[PDB]
Amino acid sequence: GSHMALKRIQKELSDLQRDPPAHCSAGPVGDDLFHWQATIMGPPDSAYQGGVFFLTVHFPTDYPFKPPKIAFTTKIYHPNINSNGSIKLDILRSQWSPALTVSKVLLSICSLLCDPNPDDPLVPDIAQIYKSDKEKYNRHAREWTQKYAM
């Protein structure tokens, strides 16, 4: 149960420490390995560049056989991320696999920032702005990055 999951989590953390990734930072908030905080930097060339985005990561007791619960703490303007930080992403639910790690999820969220999924959105308004007025989208995302993530 929790011993197994805690062992898997310790392995993932040890891998992140042994070869840190370029795409994010991640680690336990304190002594509870089930509760992690992560950070992703606004991808270069995107409307979020310069910003720092904080994620909360919570491991279920059945990890790695149940997906981790990941959400945004920093406010962001995105079609697949709403105002209170909920994320719409396949690997975080229907397409989760025990072979995946938090590192790969954060990688996929970086790609998601660089390339949203407006055809199955969490914020229809932002999705339609993204599809039909890219300039407006980049403007609002840049504004929110300057206002919340810097």
Partner: protein, 76 residues
Amino acid sequence: MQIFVKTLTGKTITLEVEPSDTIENVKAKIQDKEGIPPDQQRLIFAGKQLEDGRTLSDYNIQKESTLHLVLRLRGG
């Protein structure tokens, strides 16, 4: 006959409708005004979700009635 549509941001948009219009037609008007595709919007009125086949008359949506525009997400 015009009706109102209140979004989850507090905005209230006005629509020019006829009592015979269907929920689908109203969703097309909401799309023309706000851009949201029909399959992504859900309309609430008098405590119930409005279905595509029905008309405004079938729900007793009178003049200056208030509709509630809410999310209709798919799998998260």
